[PDB]
């Protein structure tokens, strides 16, 4: 991934988001309901000191569960690191703050097109697919407005 948002103002991504589309390098990352990177973003919560808290839902043990994970800031504004067994980065590729936000996670690679409202934003999906053609994705999903209004996009 060699797309990052120049001049990102992280405080301005705060609030409500919808995981409109997802893609990943390996089918197994997204294939099933309980696949490891089948995560549905609810809210982005920047800290005053510039970390990025992410509220999301994930299907685990036959149930739609709440998760809260902290992605810690780095020297680069558009790059955050999640504390785990593995060093994994969260990258903000692009955003206009008010409509769409493109982000990826890598260790191999998964990405999402986030939007502010439960609508199919063709313009944001164009920007997502453009970003992705530089990346070796083998699975891509997208949700309809009804699914976007349901826990775990059921």
Ligand X SMILES: CCCCCCCCCCCCCC(=O)O
Q: Using the rule CB under 8 A, is 76 a contact of a second copy?
A: no
Helix H or strand E encompassing 115: strand 109-115
Residues between 100 and 119 that touch ligand X (CB under 6 A): 103-105, 110-112
Over the range 55-89, which residues count as b (16 or more CB within 10 Å of their CB) and which as e?
ebbbbeeeeeeeeeeebebeeebbbbebeeeeeeb
Q: Which stretch binds ligand X (CB under 6 A): 34-42, 73-81, 120-128, 138-146?
A: 34-42
Q: Which one among 27, 65, 76, 134 touches a second copy, defined by CB under 8 A? A: 27
Residues near ligand X (CB under 6 A)? 37, 39, 41, 54, 58, 67, 69, 90, 103-105, 110-112
The residues that touch a second copy, with contacts defined as CB under 8 A, are 27, 31-33, 137-144
């Amino acid at each position: 991934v060699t797309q990052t948002m120049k001049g990102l103002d992280i405080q301005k991504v705060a609030g409500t988001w919808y995981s409109l589309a997802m893609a990943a390098s390996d089918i197994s990352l997204l294939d099933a309901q309980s696949a490891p990177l089948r995560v549905y973003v609810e809210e982005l919560k920047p800290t005053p000191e510039g970390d990025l808290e992410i509220l999301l839902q994930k299907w685990e043990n036959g149930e739609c569960a709440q998760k809260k994970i902290i992605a810690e800031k780095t020297k680069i504004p558009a790059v955050f690191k999640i504390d785990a067994l593995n060093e994994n980065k969260v990258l903000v590729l692009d955003t206009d703050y008010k409509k769409y936000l493109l982000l990826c996670m890598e260790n191999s690679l998964a990405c999402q097109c986030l939007v502010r409202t439960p609508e199919v934003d063709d313009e944001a999906l164009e920007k997502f697919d453009k970003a992705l053609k530089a990346l070796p994705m083998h699975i891509r999903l997208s949700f309809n407005p009804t699914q976007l209004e349901e826990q775990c996009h059921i």
